[PDB]
Ligand binder design. Structure first.
Ligand SMILES: Nc1ncnc2c1ncn2[C@@H]1O[C@@H]2COP(=O)(O)O[C@@H]3[C@H](O)[C@@H](COP(=O)(O)O[C@H]2[C@H]1O)O[C@H]3n1cnc2c(N)ncnc21
Ligand SMILES: Nc1ncnc2c1ncn2[C@@H]1O[C@@H]2COP(=O)(O)O[C@@H]3[C@H](O)[C@@H](COP(=O)(O)O[C@H]2[C@H]1O)O[C@H]3n1cnc2c(N)ncnc21
Ligand SMILES: Nc1ncnc2c1ncn2[C@@H]1O[C@@H]2COP(=O)(O)O[C@@H]3[C@H](O)[C@@H](COP(=O)(O)O[C@H]2[C@H]1O)O[C@H]3n1cnc2c(N)ncnc21
Ligand SMILES: Nc1ncnc2c1ncn2[C@@H]1O[C@@H]2COP(=O)(O)O[C@@H]3[C@H](O)[C@@H](COP(=O)(O)O[C@H]2[C@H]1O)O[C@H]3n1cnc2c(N)ncnc21
Ligand SMILES: [Mg+2]
Ligand SMILES: [Mg+2]
Ligand SMILES: [Mg+2]
Ligand SMILES: [Mg+2]
Ligand SMILES: [Mg+2]
Ligand SMILES: [Mg+2]
Ligand SMILES: [Mg+2]
Ligand SMILES: [Zn+2]
Ligand SMILES: [Zn+2]
Ligand SMILES: [Zn+2]
Ligand SMILES: [Zn+2]
Lengths: 355, 368, 369, 352
């Protein structure tokens, strides 16, 4: 055998997480089975190379005899390559909480910042529950109020440059074990058009987790277990009319309201069986919505080079993912219609994406 | 109180790190002394009036229950006990058990050899484009792949005021053919003669194809994929690859166009616009979807299908094959990997132009 | 032997509520977002002589409430110093304790000098790591009463390609200075106002830093900072008298007019005529050219005054462009460019050392109107 | 109109000074008097949440709040937020100490004088430099059958830089800054110069020097740098040799031997001593003097400068780091080959 002190044993036992390094057997199995843990009988510590605690291995008796066949406490072959690889896999898992370094971001409309102001703590506790760890004050920004020219292209561009400014400064704050940028923990509560621009700013090609505000559960997921709802599709009819995509997710949009604001519209509908305002039970719902949506958008874009007119009844989190989805190099024109308080809540064009 | 054996088990099963922040609790790196500075923290306290305390909780049973004990750094332990509402019982247990299983799965992962991590990302998007290093190494570790270092991470210079111009593609070419070769060379001694490359890319489709052609020879290439939902984790190891449907090109003369409707459906009208009179051959899947990269098998299926169709098309035209691709990043790399030596025909890669109303424009010519 | 509550409250007050050894905020939990006091008032010299750093000569009772013996530390830094007394000796902890409290005292007593946009511009044309720390720039600004709403802009030119600093390379520099920087200043626009001041530090290609200075020369409120091989972003000596700048006029003739700047080092005349045969050489120099000559911003101002009028004279002696062969610090390369921001600007051709041409001065960038 | 937590927060976030004048409002405690936190200071909103509350002294309070309504007449939000930003910057400074320990050595000095990482880490720790992972302890590779040719030295550089760059990727701190580099070297001078060639001098890098007695700790941090005396070279057509008599007086006879006809310019100190590196500023002092003279010598001739240095190890690394600019002048480094009675011999070429 190989002589070792108690500290050296406790170091080896700890760095290896109590598993044999060659076969992976959990050497703490006896304690788990209610038996006394004989640390010295259930495992042998020896050097990883023939002949520091960093070069000592933890082996089950069965594997020790296999690699130390002369019973001289030293391996016959140089097992340092496998040994270091083992410790590295353990180190990576043990440090995994480092990957939770995240940036809180709460984007609200001035209306909701005065009605349902989201406190940063509500997002931080929801983040903490999922292993997302903030390290500084969260970003809390409100969409600027539109001026005389309304929410023209300049307005929407300044909103994008503002959000991208705020997130780019914090994303520079790299850390962890590999210098990665922190994750973005983002929640939005604003009109659908503004939340789409929030998605346009953040994209979907970075470690970012969308959170959803709920009247009762706050930003905690009402049911991480719920199965995402089916996203059913109704294809558009034959014709030359303007192509309209109706999203009936939060509520069933009356197709009559869509053709009233867009006469002759060719209506394509993406819905869930029973629309409900709280249908965002967990983040997997948001992902499922994206997948189903992009599949249909590819089908609709193939049906026309003309703009796709969107009439959406979707929760806030889905409005963001929608916007984020449309951040590829490819860009098709989408004309976002929203119920306009200035026109009796009738659908009117609010935002144009892409060319 | 927790006995010594149970505390030793807590230290062992956690690998001596803080379960909430991941700090190494077995060593002081500032002064370099090995020391124990972690604390075995109780989720549910002994006294019902302690942090997370409850009336009918049996403090005698859970005093030595490993499901109730966490290895925490001194600071994290202070925080969870001084904000019991911010760190509720359910929150801690879920993270607690997730942390243990992550370690246990690493300990029981068979060694899969060494590989050089390679992240290649661009900046032609109007949003942040950043692939986390840890996620690639985690994905690798799940396959028994370890690295002597965190590997290579190349970011293409962003497009200048003129969009993706000649200067831009010159930089992309320099990044793939000079920067990468130089960083791989400097890793020559550490990784060996023919080391495996664990590659993940999220960059221009024409660029990823150039990357593939450059690494297409590097024996043992492990293409990983960035997924909008699962990031670097494979969405489904058990998912069966889809059918790669092919449409033969129309007989006659005209530029032979190769359209790939994989992540989405490429409207034919966009191809003929940038290449009129084109003879189009489409490789597609029944349901084009950004999310279709469920496992490396799907990538293996695409190369096998594409390999055949490239052979057919390459023997149907003398002139170049004009490519109009809507394909995931992982498959765009595998496209180029087939053009390294198994398909030495000239290929003209087109791509969407933000400065020309989304029209297709010629980008890189990939061939001998 | 116990620290009373008044003293512990002083310790928390004088440290700004942060750990003196790792700098974490001990007044707040950022993960869950609850204001909480998770710091500990640690004792450098312990009460018991057997404690970490214990001494028999130390009168425990006398210094139980002595701020000089009491450090606010996070719980982890406290365990480490007490579990490795050999590695954290009392004189090192005392020295760090005083350094930390003095830096707080200096911040609290700095008069408010306004806001400024931190701007870092660095290249990658060197064969070593070139990285200006962000904290060091912000700390130099704060030392001058300048604060910022964010950590500012940091632009890192693309590394040269396989062909060295080729045409593609200098195009990227142009795009980095004229497009990337302008785009990030526009995006900061609003937060900082209409005409915000720029706290700019550079360590990049001499021609690139001049083009930078030219771009930012119009935008007033320019505060140049300097990376120093010894003092980093801190000015070496605010009280140092700027050096005198000697101007050698050019000889009369029809040859190309060359401006030679010998400030960081003496530019050998043979190198200027090697690259520009028959050059009429005018020189601005300091008595002892040195890499470390930028002792304070007044040095940069002296270089401006010493040269502003001389550029007017030289432009009158030739209609052709002026060829610049400069061995100057990064901060002065930016100031030079800022001088080239006049109406009907005379053209300047910047030469630079060329690693591809055995260190010969090669023509790089042209700077004009 | 504030609670005791809000006051404790305002007092802790302002470090206990008035935000307008900067007086230490804890002065009464310093004078041995009980602290009347409520009588020595005023907490008042910054404009006509704790983030928008100011700590002021009574005198400064009576000036801004003249109408006694409890609010300022003018908006002091700009000054107040600037003050908190400055305090925050100072308090987080220990976070700017993230460093990478690098101990580069030759197998000879490694076997004869292995420098332990502990000794580097404790010296770093005293200067506020805090390592976050295992230190990098390297040994210069052994030469092949071609010796230490240009290939060997390019592998040395590529090896150091690859490992250095892998740890600099581990950004951190408050602004994502790359960690500082804490480096000590104990190897032959040419190898130490190539170490400097690798790290450069344009990044947060702090050299440490192994001292015979004081180890990796500085002998005297108050010691003023020595005067670096320069002897101009003789006029002639011979080879220009630069002799550095810093740790010892180089015998010109040994320079003439290795270089017949050498024109010797010398940089030395009044009393060459192996212990002259009393602190880092001595190294900075050596660089400045050296560069001022190298500029002078380079202007004399385009011919290569032959270096015969008797210098401490830390200075050898700084010399190598100094010659990392775009500009490059050929420098031929001569070391003593122990296989020739310690006769000087060219071992390394730095230049274009
Ligand atoms: N035919 C039709 N019938 C009914 N509504 C229809 C419609 N056609 C379109 N709509 C609109 O679709 C969205 C449904 O409401 P929602 O709550 O499910 O989603 C909203 C939305 O994403 C965004 C902007 O709200 P608004 O502009 O009112 O848009 C509304 C509604 O007008 O904020 C979300 N939001 C509001 N309050 C919230 C809260 N308390 N908690 C969480 N999210 C909340
Ligand atoms: N008619 C058409 N419809 C839709 N797209 C069309 C098209 N005609 C061409 N295209 C292009 O096909 C690619 C589809 O997107 P994708 O994600 O499936 O594949 C991309 C690609 O491989 C590479 C460069 O991106 P891009 O230049 O946008 O190429 C896009 C798009 O422009 O990065 C991948 N990528 C982007 N964002 C990602 C993310 N968030 N996560 C993981 N991978 C991501
Ligand atoms: N005959 C000659 N002799 C000496 N130099 C000569 C020459 N002929 C030309 N030159 C050039 O004069 C500049 C002197 O160096 P400097 O530091 O005083 O100024 C530089 C410059 O302003 C800019 C780009 O550097 P570079 O391209 O190397 O220009 C070098 C050098 O090539 O960055 C500055 N810079 C570099 N490294 C730095 C550091 N570590 N810390 C702070 N600032 C640093
Ligand atoms: N005429 C002449 N007279 C005296 N020396 C002369 C000479 N002509 C050349 N030389 C050489 O100049 C260098 C001065 O020695 P130094 O110790 O002051 O600095 C050395 C050097 O930087 C590097 C390589 O050492 P070496 O190869 O012996 O080169 C020696 C010596 O041979 O290691 C440093 N180093 C060695 N041991 C050390 C220790 N114990 N503590 C701290 N630093 C130590
Ligand atoms: Mg059991
Ligand atoms: Mg054996
Ligand atoms: Mg506890
Ligand atoms: Mg505690
Ligand atoms: Mg203590
Ligand atoms: Mg403790
Ligand atoms: Mg008042
Ligand atoms: Zn085993
Ligand atoms: Zn922790
Ligand atoms: Zn601390
Ligand atoms: Zn005052």
């Amino acid at each position: 055998r190989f002589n070792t002190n108690d500290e050296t044993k406790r170091i080896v036992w700890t760095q290896t997480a109590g598993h044999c390094e060659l076969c992976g057997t959990d050497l703490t199995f006896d304690y788990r089975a209610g038996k006394p843990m004989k640390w010295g009988e259930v495992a042998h510590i020896l050097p990883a190379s023939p002949k520091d605690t960093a070069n000592l291995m933890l082996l089950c008796p069965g594997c020790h005899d296999k690699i130390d066949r002369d019973a001289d406490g030293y391996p016959e072959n140089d097992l340092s390559g496998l040994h270091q690889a083992y410790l590295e896999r353990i180190r990576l898992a043990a440090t995994t909480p480092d990957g939770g370094r995240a940036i809180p971001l709460i984007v609200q409309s001035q209306h909701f910042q005065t009605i349902n102001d989201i406190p940063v703590r509500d997002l931080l506790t929801a983040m903490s529950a999922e292993g997302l760890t903030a390290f500084d004050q969260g970003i809390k920004i409100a969409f600027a109020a539109p001026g005389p020219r309304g929410r023209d292209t300049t307005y929407w561009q300044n909103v994008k440059d503002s959000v991208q400014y705020e997130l780019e400064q914090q994303l520079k704050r790299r850390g962890g074990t590999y210098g990665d940028s922190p994750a973005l923990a983002v929640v939005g509560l604003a009109d659908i058009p503004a939340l789409m621009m929030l998605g346009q700013s953040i994209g979907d090609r970075s470690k970012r987790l969308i959170f959803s505000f709920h009247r009762e559960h706050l930003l905690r997921w009402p049911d991480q277990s719920a199965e995402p709802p089916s996203f059913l599709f109704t294809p558009p009819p034959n014709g030359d009319g303007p192509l309209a995509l109706v999203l009936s997710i939060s509520a069933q949009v009356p197709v009559r309201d869509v053709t009233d604001a867009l006469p002759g519209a060719r209506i394509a509908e993406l819905s869930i069986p029973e629309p409900s305002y709280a249908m965002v039970q967990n983040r997997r719902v948001i992902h499922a919505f994206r997948d189903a949506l992009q599949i249909r958008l590819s089908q609709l874009e193939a049906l026309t080079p003309d703009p796709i007119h969107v009439f959406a009844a979707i929760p806030a989190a889905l409005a963001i993912e929608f916007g984020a989805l449309l951040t590829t190099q490819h860009q098709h024109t989408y004309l976002i219609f929203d119920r306009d308080k200035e026109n009796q809540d009738r659908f009117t064009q609010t935002l144009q994406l892409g060319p």
